[PDB]
Amino acid sequence: MVVVGLDVGYGDTKVIGVDGKRIIFPSRWAVTETESWGIGGKIPVLSTDGGQTKFIYGKYASGNNIRVPQGDGRLASKEAFPLIAAALWESGIPVDLVIGSGTPLGTFDLEVKAAKEALENKVLTVTGPEGEVRQFNITRLIMRPQGVGAALYLLNQGIIEQQPGYGVVIDVGSRTTDVLTINLMDMEPVVELSFSLQIGVGDAISALSRKIAKETGFVVPFDLAQEALSHPVMFRQKQVGGPEVSGPILEDLANRIIENIRLNLRGEVDRVTSLIPVGGGSNLIGDRFEEIAPGTLVKIKPEDLQFANALGYRDAAERSM
């Protein structure tokens, strides 16, 4: 059997293919009425209904009937389905499949139930570049709560260890920060100490954009404002942003997440033995979180930040065989 990892974020879609191959693309798609099947290796055009409709996904999906997931791990949504298909296309494998995936703890059982009805024992038939048809018979979906995936990956890599005490996975996304407190005894979530905060990197990016527009007269594209968090960039022949101006914004972002986690954990913070910053937002502010519990910061490679959940979803799926 082929085991794949899948994590359909509202921001990015991550897949770990049969050989461990890591693919990441923006979680967006748009209908195209093209007669073509796009360009293999550059801008694939796919169909899940044999060419009744077609779509482009990822980097090159733009325009203004762009479609995005309305939240993380909504595998049964109609917004996710094209991204699942693109993920399977990108993995490069009628093939029998077990998918390991996940979704936030908050709506775990509902989303799991829905994801199973939408995907389990279904055949996805995807057409792509040169009219090639690939068939994927999803025989089993195995699901873990978001954050648990990351903690399992780190356990399997020897980076953390089962013991008494709590690990706190802080997943800084673009619009949310998903905080998963896991019991290291049994790798099970502590529901009362896990929560989603409605703040993320996007808040900093939007604060920087607003501040640029306010002072300069015109509007940065989102992609450029994100870049401008980490270095100065040019728009309309003006130098704008970089750390001198993005620093206090990023600092406010870290401070608010830290304050909100302190509030939620209260005295249970004394039980924390590992703090585990993941997600793309952790690349910029992740080290600040050590001040929640000094000496507990876990060192995660930058290139694992966005895939740690998917890797662990894949691991969990392999162990159910």
Side-chain angles (χ1 to χ4, degrees), residues 1-17 19-116 118-235 237-243 245-265 267-298 300-321:
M1 288 262 139
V2 193
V3 192
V4 163
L6 179 73
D7 182 6
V8 181
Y10 59 79
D12 300 280
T13 290
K14 282 80 60 179
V15 61
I16 306 292
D19 53 350
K21 186 185 168 30
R22 293 179 186 196
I23 299 111
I24 179 162
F25 54 91
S27 287
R28 49 184 197 235
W29 60 270
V31 177
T32 163
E33 277 242 327
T34 181
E35 309 200 338
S36 87
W37 290 108
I39 303 181
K42 190 76 177 166
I43 179 175
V45 172
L46 307 187
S47 190
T48 60
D49 54 26
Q52 303 288 156
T53 63
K54 296 180 192 184
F55 63 93
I56 284 164
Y57 63 89
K59 174 186 191 160
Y60 290 118
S62 39
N64 43 28
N65 202 232
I66 294 280
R67 305 301 307 276
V68 301
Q70 309 300 125
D72 286 337
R74 309 256 185 119
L75 297 175
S77 62
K78 74 198 209 68
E79 289 96 342
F81 194 79
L83 302 175
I84 291 165
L88 294 182
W89 190 266
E90 287 287 351
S91 82
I93 13 170
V95 180
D96 277 18
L97 272 216
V98 168
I99 303 181
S101 195
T103 186
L105 188 59
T107 43
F108 188 72
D109 296 321
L110 288 171
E111 293 293 1
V112 170
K113 163 172 176 72
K116 286 183 153 109
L119 298 178
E120 220 167 36
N121 301 105
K122 261 40 128 175
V123 177
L124 296 220
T125 298
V126 185
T127 319
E130 317 308 333
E132 189 200 355
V133 183
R134 303 184 187 157
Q135 296 198 128
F136 308 93
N137 180 10
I138 296 174
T139 68
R140 205 152 135 111
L141 185 63
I142 301 292
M143 305 286 279
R144 296 283 182 277
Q146 195 168 303
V148 175
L152 299 163
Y153 176 61
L154 293 170
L155 183 66
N156 295 141
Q157 298 290 308
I159 288 147
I160 53 175
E161 163 160 48
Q162 296 190 70
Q163 55 184 274
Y166 290 168
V168 178
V169 180
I170 308 177
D171 187 340
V172 186
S174 49
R175 304 171 183 281
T176 49
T177 296
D178 183 88
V179 184
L180 192 103
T181 298
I182 201 180
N183 188 344
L184 295 177
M185 181 187 81
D186 55 6
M187 310 297 287
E188 298 182 30
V190 186
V191 174
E192 300 70 31
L193 295 180
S194 311
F195 51 86
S196 182
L197 305 176
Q198 286 160 41
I199 184 175
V201 190
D203 299 68
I205 299 171
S206 288
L208 181 57
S209 184
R210 285 191 309 273
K211 184 185 205 279
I212 290 164
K214 190 159 159 164
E215 302 177 357
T216 227
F218 42 43
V219 189
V220 209
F222 184 87
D223 267 8
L224 203 74
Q226 183 166 39
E227 228 214 278
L229 292 174
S230 82
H231 36 254
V233 208
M234 308 292 306
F235 184 76
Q237 290 143 270
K238 244 169 229 271
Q239 159 171 312
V240 118
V245 35
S246 86
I249 293 178
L250 287 176
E251 190 133 280
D252 183 58
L253 173 57
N255 287 350
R256 288 171 65 183
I257 287 163
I258 286 165
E259 292 196 285
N260 265 79
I261 290 155
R262 279 176 174 155
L263 203 165
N264 273 113
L265 298 177
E268 310 303 330
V269 69
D270 300 312
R271 290 190 194 285
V272 180
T273 61
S274 302
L275 280 171
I276 296 177
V278 301
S282 287
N283 220 354
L284 303 167
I285 56 173
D287 297 338
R288 285 296 311 287
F289 297 147
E290 185 159 34
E291 84 196 54
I292 295 154
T296 71
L297 179 57
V298 174
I300 287 147
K301 307 215 236 211
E303 69 267 22
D304 281 354
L305 288 170
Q306 286 216 82
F307 288 106
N309 273 136
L311 286 164
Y313 299 151
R314 187 277 320 272
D315 287 349
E318 258 157 10
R319 282 229 270 148
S320 317
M321 304 292 68

